[PDB]
Structure 1
């Protein structure tokens, strides 16, 4: 962990509600979502998801 051997220690947080929507859109790109689907609500329904 010493900085000379490893300069940066980037941290990956559990996805935030905005981030979960973004990941949901990325993985729903090929799916034929019916009109009236609310992706935003689905991100809110799962809190602290692991992406």
Structure 2
């Protein structure tokens, strides 16, 4: 216990966290208006951020 100062867990993302990973990576894509990214994020049941 004196060896490691703090351990940090990384969970798989949830529905609120799959949205903004989509939001950041859809920045560099040329999109079309009317997408509803919320419906896209719910199709993936928490795969990862990769």
TM class by shorter chain equals 0.7 to 0.9
Equivalent in the alignment of 2:7: 9
Aligned residues: 49
Over the aligned positions, Cα root-mean-square deviation in angstroms equals 0.9
Give the TM-score of the pair, scaled to structure 2.
0.86
| Deviation by residue 1:22-45 (Cα, 9 ceiling, x = unmatched) | 100011111111011111111101
State the TM-score, normalizing by the size of structure 1: 0.85
Which stretches of structure 1, 4 residues or more, deviate above 2 A after TM superposition?
none
5+ long unaligned stretches in structure 2: none
Query: Unpaired segments of 5 or more residues in structure 1?
Result: none
Shift of 1:5: 1.5
